Paper text:
PMT-based O-mannosylation is an evolutionarily conserved and vital process, key for cell wall integrity and protein quality control in fungi. PMTs are divided into three subfamilies (PMT1, PMT2, and PMT4) and form functional dimers either within or across subfamilies (Akasaka-Manya et al., 2006; Girrbach and Strahl, 2003). In these structures each subunit has 11 transmembrane helices (TMHs) and two large hydrophilic loops oriented towards the ER lumen (LL): loop LL1 between TMH1 and 2 harboring a catalytic DE motif, and loop LL4 between TMH7 and 8, encompassing a so-called MIR domain, whose function remains unknown. MIR domains have a β-trefoil fold consisting of six β-hairpins arranged within a pseudo-threefold symmetry.
The high resolution of the Pmt2-MIR (1.6 Å) and Pmt3-MIR (1.9 Å) structures allowed for a detailed analysis of the respective structural properties and ligand interactions. Amino acid ranges for Pmt2-MIR are 339–401 (MIRm1), 402–466 (MIRm2) and 467–532 (MIRm3). In order to understand the role of PMT-MIR domains in protein O-mannosylation, we analyzed the Pmt2-MIR structure for specific surface properties. On the protein surface two regions reveal high sequence conservation, in the following denoted as sites α and β (residue ranges see Figure 2) in accordance with general CBM terminology. For Pmt2, H362 and H364 are fixed in a defined orientation by a complex hydrogen-bonding pattern within the strictly conserved site α in the interface between MIRm1 and MIRm3. MIRm1 site α, which is directly adjacent to the conserved L361 of the core, is completed by residues Y380, D384, N386, F504, and Q506 forming the wall of the cavity. An almost identical arrangement is found for Pmt2-MIR site β in the MIRm1-MIRm2 interface. Both cavities are filled by ligands present in the crystallization solvent (glycerol in site α [also in Pmt3] and sulfate in site β). Although Pmt2-MIR displays a pseudo-threefold symmetry typical for the β-trefoil fold classified as Type C CBMs, the analogous site γ (the third binding site present in β-trefoils) is not present in MIRm3. However, on the surface of the β11-β12 loop a two-residue insertion is present, which is specific to the PMT2 family (including Pmt2, Pmt3, and Pmt6) and human POMTs. This loop forms a surface exposed ligand-binding site in Pmt2-MIR, from now on defined as PMT2 family-specific site δ. The three residues form a trident that has picked another glycerol ligand from the solvent via hydrogen-bonding to the arginine side chain and to the backbone amides within site δ.
Numbering used by the authors: 340 to 532
């Protein structure tokens, strides 16, 4: 089953050395924007779960919708943390450890937020033979670009301070090289219905 808008709940794994799972929780940044932390995490738990929602300002996905909408590279989506309902978010705020990159946070909901909540998928590799323009669990590698800031979601390899449970720093990288695997991700788990 290809990944769908709204109904697909996924975990998302980073492909650099020591890369792990995109993660959030209710604790906030002590400096920076003071918004909700986003990290990478080395174990499997429900705080690794995300789903894709429509771009800011369009109708939120509803289970009452009858048609399935498969994710498309190049389309703007929000990436929503399932346990907290916050949107993956960035902005021109320095990251907590990689001070030359941008902080990535969880922000707002279906009402609260703005166009900095819009992200765009770019497929970098398909090892399978399925539709090369769709996302497939495990076998599709992709980058996740913030549309407004132009930067790429990345796990830097830095550990956070104790205030982030010593989890892995996530930033939005400015002008990375295309093959930088800190910016490459895959769907690691997929549950739908």
């Amino acid at each position: 089953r290809d990944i769908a808008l709204g109904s697909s709940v996924v975990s998302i794994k980073n492909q650099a050395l020591g890369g792990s799972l995109l993660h959030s929780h209710i604790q906030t940044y002590p400096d920076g924007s003071n918004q909700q932390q986003v990290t990478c995490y080395g174990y499997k738990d429900a705080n690794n779960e995300w789903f894709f929602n429509r771009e800011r300002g369009l109708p939120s996905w509803s289970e009452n919708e009858t048609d399935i909408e498969y994710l498309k590279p190049g389309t703007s989506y929000r990436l929503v943390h399932k346990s907290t309902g916050r949107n993956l978010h960035t902005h021109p705020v320095a990251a907590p450890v990689s001070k030359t990159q941008w902080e990535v946070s969880g922000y707002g909901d279906n009402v609260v937020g703005d166009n900095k909540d819009n992200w765009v998928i770019e497929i970098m590799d398909q090892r399978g033979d399925e539709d090369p323009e769709k996302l497939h669990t495990l076998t599709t590698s992709f980058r996740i670009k913030n549309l407004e800031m132009g930067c790429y979601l990345a796990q830097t390899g830095n550990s956070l301070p104790e205030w982030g449970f010593r989890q892995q720093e996530v930033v939005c990288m400015k002008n990375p090289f295309k093959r930088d695997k800190r910016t490459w991700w895959n769907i690691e788990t997929h549950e739908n219905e």
